[PDB]
Design a protein around this ligand. Structure first.
Ligand SMILES: NS(=O)(=O)c1ccc(CC[n+]2c(-c3ccccc3)cc(-c3ccccc3)cc2-c2ccccc2)cc1
Ligand SMILES: [Zn+2]
Length: 261
């Protein structure tokens, strides 16, 4: 992707992606608006299993469109299974999408409601061997989406907030060991699920989306720090990293299932 030029600006934003990535107008694109009254409770869904006790984080990176907290996924240590999934999915990284204002920032919406941000914990299906092969499969990834609203601070997020100063610009990374992602989960694991895609190019249709109904609360100061990051690299005109979210796409021929009544 050394020649990719997509972004979230006015000239390379979501409405332009289809030119370089035609699958942008595909049949199972994400995110989507979750119509709570049309999502049907599916009694056959199993409880979700999030096992992060052995998660091993390694680094945090500003990649020019978000920041990723990467994990060592060379062994089965932080896995997601159950719920709508068959098999075991291993955690590889998490990142967020956020807005320039508290009134927007999430990718998925709930009855058109936009949250201040959205956390994505990305997992790949171990039956495919590695992440690169998994994204080429319809059931290659499971992304756990969690909404963020502004209110009380999330203690578990502060370590992330404090390290952002060190990765202000595109390409900067910092050691980020021993970060426990369990500190970013809400109390309830009730969720909605549907088949979709990566929400940034290459927009591959390889994701089983699992979006939690309960958002976590983060403080205004915490999200404010996210907004001080830069999309640009060091030494270039500063462009604040805000509004790095893709808007809701057509649901087309898909049903969103709810794990709860
Ligand atoms: N929002 S999401 O649906 O959860 C989603 C998950 C994974 C991905 C692919 C991961 N990814 C990201 C990437 C994208 C978004 C967030 C974090 C990293 C960047 C480059 C990148 C490209 C150019 C320069 C710098 C970074 C690449 C990839 C990527 C692609 C395919 C295979 C392997 C990695 C895309 C979307
Ligand atoms: Zn994402």
């Amino acid at each position: 992707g050394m020649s990719h030029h997509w972004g979230y600006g006015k000239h390379n934003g979501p409405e332009h992606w289809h030119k370089d990535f035609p699958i942008a107008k595909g049949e199972r694109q994400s995110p989507v608006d979750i119509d709570t009254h049309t999502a049907k409770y599916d009694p056959s869904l199993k409880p979700l299993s999030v096992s992060y006790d052995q998660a091993t984080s390694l680094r945090i990176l500003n990649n020019g469109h978000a920041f990723n907290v990467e994990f060592d996924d060379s062994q089965d240590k932080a896995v997601l299974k159950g719920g709508p999934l068959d098999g075991t999915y291993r955690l590889i990284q998490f990142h967020f999408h956020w807005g320039s204002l508290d009134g927007q920032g999430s990718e998925h919406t709930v009855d058109k409601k936009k949250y201040a941000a959205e956390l994505h914990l990305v997992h790949w299906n171990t039956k495919y061997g590695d992440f690169g092969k998994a994204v080429q499969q319809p059931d290659g990834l499971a992304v756990l989406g969690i909404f963020l609203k502004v209110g009380s601070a999330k203690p578990g997020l502060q370590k992330v907030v404090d390290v952002l100063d060190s990765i202000k610009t595109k390409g900067k990374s910092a050691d980020f060991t021993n970060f426990d992602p369990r500190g970013l989960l809400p109390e309830s694991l009730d969720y909605w699920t549907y088949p979709g895609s990566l929400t940034t190019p290459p927009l591959l249709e390889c994701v089983t989306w699992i979006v939690l109904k309960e958002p976590i609360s983060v403080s205004s100061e915490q999200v404010l720090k996210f907004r001080k990051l830069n999309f640009n690299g060091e030494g270039e005109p500063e462009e604040l990293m805000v509004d790095n979210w893709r808007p809701a796409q057509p649901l087309k021929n898909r049903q969103i299932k709810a794990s709860f009544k």
